[PDB]
Design an enzyme around this catalytic site. Structure first.
Site, PDB file in Angstrom:
ATOM      1  N   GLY A  30       0.768  -1.227   0.000  1.00 13.56           N
ATOM      2  CA  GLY A  30       0.000   0.000   0.000  1.00 13.56           C
ATOM      3  C   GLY A  30       0.813   1.299   0.000  1.00 13.56           C
ATOM      4  N   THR A  31       0.108   2.387  -0.285  1.00 11.89           N
ATOM      5  CA  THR A  31       0.556   3.757  -0.104  1.00 11.89           C
ATOM      6  C   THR A  31       1.166   4.007   1.277  1.00 11.89           C
ATOM      7  OG1 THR A  31      -0.970   4.847  -1.596  1.00 11.89           O
ATOM      8  CG2 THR A  31      -0.531   5.899   0.504  1.00 11.89           C
ATOM      9  N   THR A  32       2.169   4.862   1.370  1.00  8.56           N
ATOM     10  CA  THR A  32       2.670   5.149   2.705  1.00  8.56           C
ATOM     11  C   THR A  32       1.763   6.122   3.507  1.00  8.56           C
ATOM     12  OG1 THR A  32       4.585   6.377   3.677  1.00  8.56           O
ATOM     13  CG2 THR A  32       4.837   5.558   1.411  1.00  8.56           C
TER      14      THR A  32
END
Ligand SMILES: *[C@@H]1[C@H]2C3=C(C)C(=O)C(O)=C2[C@@H]2O[C@H](CC[C@H](C)/C=C(\C)C[C@@H](C)C[C@H](C)[C@]1(O)O3)[C@H](C)[C@H](O)[C@H]2C
Lengths: 140, 233
Positions: A30-32
């Site tokens: 996922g996105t940070t």
């Protein structure tokens, strides 16, 4: 023989739940997102990938409010995150209903903790594909 | 199926040129015992809505907690909570009215008469009533319980049909409202001198006055009254 990883609540012979470990992989993918505690509050931030110009800027909000004083942000499978937050919202409403005061953040952490744990107890469910950063301010 | 225990008496209200006014005294009666003295029965919701409540106080407090919850809930995943997607008085009203009618349909009423006053986002005045039966109605003036009998006649002197609304100012509406609280204090044995009043105005916002008092009370003539018929001293 193996296959200890095909089914959610199975201990591997070294005592691990492979399905949970695979759920971590979806998170890592996922996105940070992050959280920083300051000396009277907390700040949440997240990276939203612009797949294309076509995404309306500012409009697909990722960070969610629980009650009036709690923020949560997460990386991984976004719908899982929402489902976690829906539960958190029920969980804080109930607490407020019964006890009048808004839910203390430690109390609230455990409510999410128990629910997410619950999803490692059975093979009829899958673990959450998120890690959640969350917090806020309370009576202390 | 129940019976009111701690109760609040009239809530009165009317609309004027640019908004609505709504008032209710601060007493929680326990039958004939004037039991509680700092009871707020005007519930502000958002900056555009006041919910005035009479009837059972326990049930009032319950409606109060429902209203807090609406605000919380509407806020959720809603970037426009403080703008286009705020709660409108009409929404808060339809919600209460639904609840009141469902509770009468289950033979377990919330024992109240309620008036929702506020201003819609387009500026329109909102004034509607709902009660423990789920019965609803609108009028340029609206009053509950005892207020219906004594306040309405006076408020209706000022605004008598819709066309009176544009002609009526805050100064004049507030005057009429304050006047009606005075009259209700004179003749309602379940009323108090102390009251809250709220103005919701399409330009000036929400003004919430606490700790008002019924003014200018005529009692002097009482000294010239002796006996019940034939007595002289
Ligand atoms: C005086 C009002 C009144 C009631 C309940 C009523 O039925 C009635 O006929 C009167 C009359 O009001 C006249 C003025 C009318 C005007 C729209 C109102 C003003 C200036 C101020 C209000 C606060 C007055 C009340 C509605 C009132 O106290 O109740 C005259 C003053 C008449 O002399 C009087 C009979």
């Amino acid at each position: 023989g193996t296959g200890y990883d095909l089914s959610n609540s199975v201990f591997s012979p070294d005592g691990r739940n492979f399905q949970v470990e695979y759920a971590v992989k979806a998170v890592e993918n996922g996105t940070t997102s992050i959280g920083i505690k300051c000396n009277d509050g907390v700040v949440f931030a997240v990276e939203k990938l612009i797949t294309s110009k076509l995404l309306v800027p500012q409009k697909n909000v990722k960070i969610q409010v629980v009650d009036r004083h709690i923020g949560c942000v997460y990386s991984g499978l976004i719908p899982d995150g929402r489902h976690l937050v829906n539960r958190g919202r029920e969980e804080a409403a109930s607490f407020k209903k019964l006890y009048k005061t808004p839910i203390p953040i430690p109390a609230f952490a455990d409510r999410l903790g128990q629910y997410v744990q619950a999803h490692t107890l059975y093979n009829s469910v899958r673990p959450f594909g998120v890690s959640t950063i969350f917090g806020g301010v309370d009576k202390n | 199926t129940q019976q009111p225990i701690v109760t609040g008496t009239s809530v009165i209200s009317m609309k004027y040129d640019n908004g609505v006014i709504i008032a209710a005294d601060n007493l929680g009666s326990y039958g004939s015992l004037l039991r509680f003295n700092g009871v707020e029965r005007l519930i502000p919701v958002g900056d555009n809505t006041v919910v005035g409540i009479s009837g059972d106080i326990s049930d009032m407090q319950h409606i109060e907690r429902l209203l807090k919850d609406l605000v919380t809930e509407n806020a959720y995943d809603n970037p426009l909570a403080d703008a286009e997607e705020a709660l409108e008085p009409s929404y808060i009203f339809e919600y209460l009215a639904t609840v009141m009618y469902q509770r009468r349909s289950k033979m377990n009423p919330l024992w109240n008469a309620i008036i929702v006053a506020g201003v819609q986002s387009n500026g329109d005045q909102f004034l509607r009533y709902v009660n423990l039966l789920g019965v609803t109605y609108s009028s340029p003036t609206l009053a509950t319980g005892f207020g219906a009998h004594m306040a309405n006649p006076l408020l209706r002197k000022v605004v008598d049909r819709e066309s009176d609304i544009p002609k009526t100012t805050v100064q004049v509406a507030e005057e009429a409202i304050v006047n009606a609280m005075r009259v209700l204090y004179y003749r309602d044995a379940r009323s108090s001198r102390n009251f809250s009043l709220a103005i919701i105005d399409k330009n000036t916002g929400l003004t919430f006055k606490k700790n008002l008092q019924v003014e200018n009370m005529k009692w002097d003539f009482a000294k010239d009254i002796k006996g019940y018929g034939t007595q002289k001293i």
